[PDB]
Amino acid sequence: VAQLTIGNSTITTQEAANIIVGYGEWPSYCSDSDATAVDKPTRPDVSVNRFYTLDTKLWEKSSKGWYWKFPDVLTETGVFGQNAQFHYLYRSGFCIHVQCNASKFHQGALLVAVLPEYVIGTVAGGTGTEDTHPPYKQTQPGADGFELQHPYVLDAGIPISQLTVCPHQWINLRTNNCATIIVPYINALPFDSALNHCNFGLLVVPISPLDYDQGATPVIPITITLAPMCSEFAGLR
Amino acid sequence: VAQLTIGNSTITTQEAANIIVGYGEWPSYCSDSDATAVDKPTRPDVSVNRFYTLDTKLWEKSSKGWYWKFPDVLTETGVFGQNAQFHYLYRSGFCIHVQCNASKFHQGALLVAVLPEYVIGTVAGGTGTEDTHPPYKQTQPGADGFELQHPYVLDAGIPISQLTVCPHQWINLRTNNCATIIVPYINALPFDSALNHCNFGLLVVPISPLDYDQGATPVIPITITLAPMCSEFAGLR
Amino acid sequence: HSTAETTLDSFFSRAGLVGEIDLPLKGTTNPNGYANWDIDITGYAQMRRKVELFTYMRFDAEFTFVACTPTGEVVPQLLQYMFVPPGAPKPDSRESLAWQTATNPSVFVKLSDPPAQVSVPFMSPASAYQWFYDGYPTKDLEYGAMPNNMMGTFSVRTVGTSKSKYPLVVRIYMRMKHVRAWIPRPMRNQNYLFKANPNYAGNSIKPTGASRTAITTL
Amino acid sequence: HSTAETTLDSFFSRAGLVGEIDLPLKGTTNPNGYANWDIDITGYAQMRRKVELFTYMRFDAEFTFVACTPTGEVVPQLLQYMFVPPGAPKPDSRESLAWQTATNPSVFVKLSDPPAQVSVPFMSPASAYQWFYDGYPTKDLEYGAMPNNMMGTFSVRTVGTSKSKYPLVVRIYMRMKHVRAWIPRPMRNQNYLFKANPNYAGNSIKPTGASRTAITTL
Amino acid sequence: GFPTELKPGTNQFLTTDDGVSAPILPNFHPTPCIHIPGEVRNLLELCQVETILEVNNVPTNATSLMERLRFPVSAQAGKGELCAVFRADPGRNGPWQSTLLGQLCGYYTQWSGSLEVTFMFTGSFMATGKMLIAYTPPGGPLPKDRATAMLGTHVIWDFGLQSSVTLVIPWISNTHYRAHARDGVFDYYTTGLVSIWYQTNYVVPIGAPNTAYIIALAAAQKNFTMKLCKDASDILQTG
Amino acid sequence: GFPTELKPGTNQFLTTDDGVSAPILPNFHPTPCIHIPGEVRNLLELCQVETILEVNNVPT
Ligand code: NA
């Protein structure tokens, strides 16, 4: 156990469980001989790259699961959201740290994964004859994230049983309370629109449901802390 | 003349006539870099590989011939049959020793051969319009072996006159009373089912009929003694 | 011991039937002796789910045109297969000047000649095609649309000023080649509803596979 | 002095007629403009006895399709020869989606084009095909059945949605190549009764060859 | 000119011929590929990745589908009881259908190799007990009781000591050909069985739940392979 | 292109021509051959093996 600091942000955490480096690649920068070498892309350091701890979610027996979209999740939040909006192009990596706080008498297991291009789908009017399209509140939910309505198919017609094919980590209350994942910038272009395109989604779903006996705190806190890594912005507005 | 022993089994036999090594190949084992290298195939030594002497058959003037199926012939017999049944896969070679006991006043000649994949056929209702199929008692006759009904065509539409194209040896009473044949494991797969597939048949047929004068023992004993060589079993049950 | 059959190239090889152009004499269908087929790799049923095992892909395609009458009969007819690349105007009539625009590669061939065959390069302005795009192109109806995936269009037609004497059919086969893919994802387990999105029938959400009576009875 | 003609390859060379598919216009026979021919090397009469001189064999095959009308006439008709490999579902109708499944290699050819020709590999999951199997696959009707000898199936048909204007016939020739064999056995000397087993007519058991009056008279 | 003779096969179009054809845009220069993380080059990579095995493929009720991802163990159960059982049949219908491995087997005809199944106990930390996980090779029949299951290949798993445990299916081979109805399939027979038994009862102190769930993850080992591509699916692009 | 002249015999199918033809399954890898005892390579081997001569080909 030891507490780390980046700028003015300080989180208390355990020495070092096993971190997961998405696709074995560390988030890196983009070198000079690139498409936009005229408009030098400023690489924020100071405050922009630090610990952002979002509103804790409460895990319940009934909870189906939550997901957040990146970079959307921070585009509203502080000085990162500052750059995310008034800059034409963006690229960046992320350190994601999902932590729980529960007693040795609580039980359950969360699957924490990162899915690039997490396109959401709708129920299509139930009968599937309605070509309905997900709302903006569902597509880009902000820092509060959004709750899954049909986890089994990840609200998108795909088996969550296979979600482990993506960078992921398990949070099994009887053995660990935190998961850490490093995501490199993943896209078909070197730079892209921070507000229009969400490069990936953060999924945290209960596979083994929360449980405890009557009298124990009934809601367990899932706290997402995340820090940008090697972020770059271009074209100020 | 000298008597040899393997384990607790001891047979009395003549120094060493000419042995026949089927297809010039000695029965060998199957090395580590094989399909099942996870489930190490135990290679029985102790008691499993020893002298099994089956119920003697009585050769008569009328006798048409006998055949036995391997490994079927021992799957009932003792500790080999033990492994043959409660093991998923099997491979093995064999030393086959066919011996007669007759006086210098008896006469006749047996052809002893080994035929891999000795598929038996039926008379097909006589007219050949019935697609009848051989019984299990005929297909896999046990240690008592089975008697040929139509030797000329080896109960399978093929000329016994050409059976010599297979590993074989002659037992001509006026010159010898025993034949010995070494059979290597012969199959299109490295391992196979001991109870469902009979890798080969042992045929012993009189070509020159038994004969003797009135007063001489009228039935001559054909005694089959056989020993497994380099047997392997896999997947215990 | 070998593993070639499980390589991406192996998995995506083969020429499949992706399109079928009908050029009837009398009819409601394609009444102008011409047809415009925008290239859709999804034409081969089975393809959608397969390519969607990945997020990003890159490849070339070999197109083969097998033409005949609806009885499979071969007739003395000349045809024109024009490839109008993305960004180019497609023909709107049998007499459109597009059919004559040099920058739209055309192959002229006889129905008697063996199938026509050509190669189409990776067209995207992006580094790779991508089956999923979580965003909007600069609630909405534009969600998930990656336009930079247009491969082009094939405009088919009998040659000549006068209608063809014969009723025709052109089948388009496509073979993917030089395949590369990134970011694997869970395999679709609910039936598809629309070509453009992952929408699934929320009433009929079925289990990924077969079920049984109890977990203790095989 | 030479011995090449007695090599196994020599003994088993040549393309023989193994199959004949009839595609009549009016008829009881193959009424759906298609036919499924499971590959049977026994199609050439003479073959069975020859391959059965051995117990185990391994080889490739070159298949040649010679098509025409029953008068040997050549007509402007397009055909489809689809090879559905063992384990794959064969078409059940002229409109089966099998005809469109990419994993079933198909060759499209004109009756006017010279014979189609393709090569089929050693398909067995076993190390070799085997004409004799003394056992049962995990009194019975399954005795002697080695299933792992399936080479695949050829589904033939005229192309198109509408029936062909012409009455056709497709003859399938097969040439064995790269032959290897093991464990020779006595050559069949009694007539065959059933394709799948060695059953022989027990009433009519004939002597292997010709006879004479006495052993002392030539 | 140069003497030539056209040979049979001339003019045919073989859907699987991988020849070369004329380029439509000879001067076009495709945008260059850049580096994208996570490239896959051989499906076998995905086959080796563990995914959830729906051992509990029982509930079909839409709102209970998530329950198939986990099976329970409880106080109620008595020592020796059979907990769950399933066969090692990646390509056939059943639990493996949920695994990415099972799904990929569906695009092939034959396959073989070793498998691996990891069991994750997700009960309370305060909960303890022992389970006997057993593998019965192909042919062998499900053990009558714990006792006999113990005589075979097995693992005594103490979820008090370790939270996960991995079993290795030594070998499965979907090669034996079949010709049942009129449709020729290439099925297993190599169905080894995995049976899970309560060795001890589920032990827990006051305040700890009396039911916990186990999640099963599975994947193929490195010696795994697949042959004969076979495109098949019920999920096809719509009209 | 490259100048060519088709010669007589063009397009014929000779049952004994041992040319090469397109492979139906180019990616398929046939299970490997293992060693099986008793391979025969030339019929003459069998010809040299003694078999019974029915000198007494009389009874039928
Ligand atoms: Na000339």
TrEMBL record, chains C, D:
Capsid protein VP1: Interacts with capsid protein VP0, and capsid protein VP3 to form heterotrimeric protomers. Five protomers subsequently associate to form pentamers which serve as building blocks for the capsid. Interacts with capsid protein VP2, capsid protein VP3 and capsid protein VP4 following cleavage of capsid protein VP0. Homodimer. Interacts with host GBF1. Interacts (via GOLD domain) with host ACBD3 (via GOLD domain); this interaction allows the formation of a viral protein 3A/ACBD3 heterotetramer with a 2:2 stoichiometry, which will stimulate the recruitment of host PI4KB in order to synthesize PI4P at the viral RNA replication sites. It is found in: Host cytoplasmic vesicle membrane; Host nucleus; Virion. Capsid protein VP0: Component of immature procapsids, which is cleaved into capsid proteins VP4 and VP2 after maturation. Allows the capsid to remain inactive before the maturation step. Capsid protein VP4: Lies on the inner surface of the capsid shell. After binding to the host receptor, the capsid undergoes conformational changes. Capsid protein VP4 is released, Capsid protein VP1 N-terminus is externalized, and together, they shape a pore in the host membrane through which the viral genome is translocated into the host cell cytoplasm. It comes from the Viruses. It comes from Human enterovirus 71 (EV71). Belongs to the picornaviruses polyprotein family. This is Genome polyprotein.
